Amino acid sequence: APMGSDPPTACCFSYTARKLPRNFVVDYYETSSLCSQPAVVFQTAASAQVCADPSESWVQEYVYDLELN
């Protein structure tokens, strides 16, 4: 099980300006670390995935909510 060489990965390049209400957020996932510019990614219902700057409180509260319920 020899890990790959050094294949780049998905690392947030830009964030969405409009906050999508919880109703359109059933799950989420975090970028990585190989990039010194991480962030939090949220899933939806009619899209897929979209990065979000964790610098905004509502983004953190959204994560904290998904951590519980």
């Binding site: 830009s14 300006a17 409009r18 897929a48 979209v50």
Partner: protein, 242 residues
């Protein structure tokens, strides 16, 4: 000889004459270079899948909206697309942005392009128009996301000999407005990736109503830079994927 005549005032027949009204549209061209590893894949316009949130409030698919009242206060849906082709799977979620009616694609060498934009009035397709107020309001909230992946569907191409409907708008250099949202790219099948977007009048530029954005992705190297993306790709070799 359809002598029925499509009236004239129709937004689909021609541009409006109400000074305080404009035919706001959108244009999003994109060039992606394949890795010297990926196999051959010219099968472009494989397929397209249009999707949209529950929108308004007809019947929330198991709590998919407000779950309660839904007058007209707030309820912005997202239109998603999954144009497969070129051995690559491109997808984008337009939120509070003009309604895309034109979808094309093409393949040349080890790269493939995709033209996603709205239709200009007088093309046989709707092209609503609004006032400057709503225009400036839209151009601000309008946000488009992107998430390309590596496909493998060797299926055939589904195109139409019907020319591609343009937005009459040019990707020239103008006011900068951050419209591009998230952009996920799996190196596994994408070496380079250029992004270019625009929003303005489809009848006649209006400066204030004109804007643009874009980036330059090369070998994992990103870089913001407003440049003339008019030649970014050959608008001729475009082909409607239906």
């Amino acid at each position: 000889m359809p002598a029925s005549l499509q009236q004239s005032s129709s937004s689909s027949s021609s541009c409006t004459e109400e000074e305080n009204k404009h035919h706001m549209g959108i244009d999003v061209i994109i060039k992606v270079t394949k890795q010297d590893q990926t196999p051959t894949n010219d099968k472009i316009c494989q397929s397209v899948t249009e999707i949209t949130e529950s929108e308004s409030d007809p019947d929330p698919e198991v709590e998919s909206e407000d779950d309660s009242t839904s007058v007209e206060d707030v309820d912005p849906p997202t239109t998603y697309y999954s144009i497969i082709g070129g051995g690559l799977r491109m997808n984008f979620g337009f939120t509070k942005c003009p309604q895309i009616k034109s979808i094309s694609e093409s393949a040349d060498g080890n790269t493939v392009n995709a033209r996603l934009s709205s239709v200009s009035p007088g093309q046989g397709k709707d092209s609503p128009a609004i006032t400057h107020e709503e225009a400036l309001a839209m151009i601000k909230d309008c946000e488009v996301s992107i998430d390309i992946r590596c496909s493998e569907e060797e299926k055939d191409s589904d195109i139409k000999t019907h020319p591609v409907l343009g937005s009459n708008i040019s990707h020239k250099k103008v006011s900068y407005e951050d419209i591009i949202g998230s952009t996920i790219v799996d190196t596994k099948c994408v070496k380079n990736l250029e992004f270019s977007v625009r929003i303005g009048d489809m009848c006649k530029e209006s400066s204030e109503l004109e804007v643009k954005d874009g980036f330059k992705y090369v070998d994992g190297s990103a870089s913001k830079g407003a440049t003339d993306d008019t030649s970014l790709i050959d608008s001729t070799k475009l082909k409607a994927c239906v």
